[PDB]
Amino acid sequence: GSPEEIRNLLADVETFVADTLKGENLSKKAKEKRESLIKKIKDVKSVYLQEFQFPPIAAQDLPFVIKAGYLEKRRKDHSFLGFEWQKRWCALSKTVFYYYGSDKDKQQKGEFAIDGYDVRMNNTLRKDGKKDCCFEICAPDKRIYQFTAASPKDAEEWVQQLKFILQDLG
Amino acid sequence: PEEIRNLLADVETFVADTLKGENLSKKAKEKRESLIKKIKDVKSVYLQEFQFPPIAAQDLPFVIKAGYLEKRRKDHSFLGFEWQKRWCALSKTVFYYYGSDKDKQQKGEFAIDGYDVRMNNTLRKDGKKDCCFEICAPDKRIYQFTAASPKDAEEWVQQLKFILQDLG
């Protein structure tokens, strides 16, 4: 509605209905209703997506997918050794960046939490005509992920979205 | 926006009605009660979007607009009854009027559904004449008001017209 405070409420609502009432000695009608409300609480979470725009998990079950798309991906330290870019379906699910073989896979090839990372355009990562499509996601532990996006715009949109999440959430 | 208030309606119904007289522990009861007051409290945040038992002026829920006005009924003006200072408050779709902002109880009130409203600069021989309006009930009763400036009048009309129309 006018958001923070409402999400503050719904958080308390969820704590209540899901935990506080757990174990309680409730009518059959009240139990059935509690299960309902929990599901509805769950589904409503997706609504606050536009505002923002590790266990195995399928591509299609990722919750709160802020951005997803095909990118080429390559770690910096593989690049030095001459390893080819890999086509990956990348997803930013909440604060965690996931990568898969395609959007239908049942399990991720890898992921990482972006807290603390930096991101930027970087036109030097490739020698061909696709070099304008490139950005990198820097780890604190010095790990660096390089991407090529499908167009200069595709890349910029990724860097903007990721930069938004990295710094407007403190 | 809607989707959130729809959830909150189901929420308020569960916590306040479904859970009424259920066999709840002390902590579940306390938390229940504490959530009820929290659900009522948030209601005021959707006020901007819109801008009979005795009830005090100050316990009135969802006050879209409120103010001092002079009130008179047209059918009473004929007999000579004059304008009286009233604190008026639109609480949802109900128009309340009190002798002051502090009273314990309304002099009266009416729900405005199906009413009309209009500016009417023909009701006073005064320097106050460009600042009156009327609210007209379907039963043909007409409530005339004088506001504290022409702008204040138009504000009440705009505000009333808004509720009387896009609520629907």
Task: Say which CATH class B52-168 falls into.
Answer: mainly beta
Sorted by where each begins, the domain ranges of chain A are 1-53, 54-170
Tell which residue, B126, B128, B96, has the closest CA to residue B112: B96
Tell which residue, A64, A92, A62, A91, has the closest CA to residue A165: A92
CA–CA distance from B157 to each of A145, A159, B51, B113, B122 (Å)?
A: 61, 49, 12, 15, 16
Contact A24 B27 (CB under 8 A): no
Which chain A residues are within 8 Å of B24, Cβ to Cβ?
24-25
Using a CB–CB cutoff of 8 Å, tell me whether B16 touches chain A: no
* Chain A, nearest residue to B2 by Cα: A1
Using a CB–CB cutoff of 8 Å, tell me whether A12 touches chain B: yes
Using a CB–CB cutoff of 8 Å, tell me whether B27 touches chain A: yes
Nearest 5°: the CA angle A21, A23, A24 is 55
3-state secondary structure (DSSP) of residue A106: coil
Q: In what order do the strands lie in the sheet with A110-113?
A: A110-113, A96-100, A86-93, A65-75, A144-148, A134-138, A118-121
Which CATH number among 3.90.1170.50, 3.40.50.261, 2.30.29.30, 3.90.550.10 corresponds to the domain A54-170?
A: 2.30.29.30
Given B1, B14, B22, which is nearest A27 (Cβ)?
B22
- The Cα–Cα gap between A156 and A133 comes to 8
* Chain A, nearest residue to B48 by Cα: A2
Contact B14 A37 (CB under 8 A): yes
Task: Say which CATH class A1-53 falls into.
Answer: special
Question: To which residue do tokens 């195995």 refer?
Answer: A56
Task: Say which CATH class B1-51 falls into.
Answer: special
- The Cα–Cα gap between B94 and B88 comes to 10
The answer for residues whose C-beta is within 8 angstroms of residue B139's C-beta and 6 or more apart is none
Q: Are strands A110-113 and A96-100 parallel, antiparallel or unpaired?
A: antiparallel
Contact A158/A147 with Cβ under 8 angstroms? yes
3-state secondary structure (DSSP) of residue B144: strand
Query: What is the residue type of A50?
Result: Q
Q: What is the DSSP string of B73-132?
A: EHHHHTTT---EEEEEEEETTEEEEESSTT-SS-SEEEE-TT-EEEE-TTS-SSTTGGGE
